[PDB]
Design a protein around this ligand. Sequence first.
Ligand SMILES: O=C(O)[C@@]1(F)CN(c2cc(Nc3ccccc3)ncn2)CC12CCC2
Length: 167
Amino acid sequence: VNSFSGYLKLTDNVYIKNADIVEEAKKVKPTVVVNAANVYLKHGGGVAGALNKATNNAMQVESDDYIATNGPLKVGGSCVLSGHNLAKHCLHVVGPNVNKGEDIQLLKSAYENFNQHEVLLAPLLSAGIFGADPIHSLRVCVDTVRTNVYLAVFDKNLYDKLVSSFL
Ligand SMILES: O=C(O)[C@@]1(F)CN(c2cc(Nc3ccccc3)ncn2)CC12CCC2
């Protein structure tokens, strides 16, 4: 038993809710919140900009030190950093950004990072400003992640569509 509430169960291990991931994180305080990161951990907009804003820019300060030490992430890769006031940990995962021409097949590699964590609160990778089809992203999530994932979808219209088209 865990503290996630109002989710619709899609599969054995994948759940989905129309929710603002920032507000869901602040309420649940999950062990892991997933950020929709880029390779530079520049949290300017989308989910990343919202998560970082909610930490009063502490996420960005920590991220800049991480990059100065380690260099950029790989597309499809991840790193674990602090969850600040939102979660114990933040798993920064880089989905391919279609608006940069990145290979969509890397979306499966991105979701594989979730399997290193027993339970996660996450957005749909490569959705939103990353330019992928959220329905494809949901399919890859379901077919790749084996651990327990609670998907927060900000847009109510999109949430309903994703549900109504789910196979
Ligand atoms: O749809 C997009 O463009 C996105 F940038 C934003 N989406 C969100 C967004 C969210 N809260 C939120 C984020 C920013 C402002 C207000 C609320 N909570 C969950 N998902 C997923 C996405 C990141 C990858 C695709």
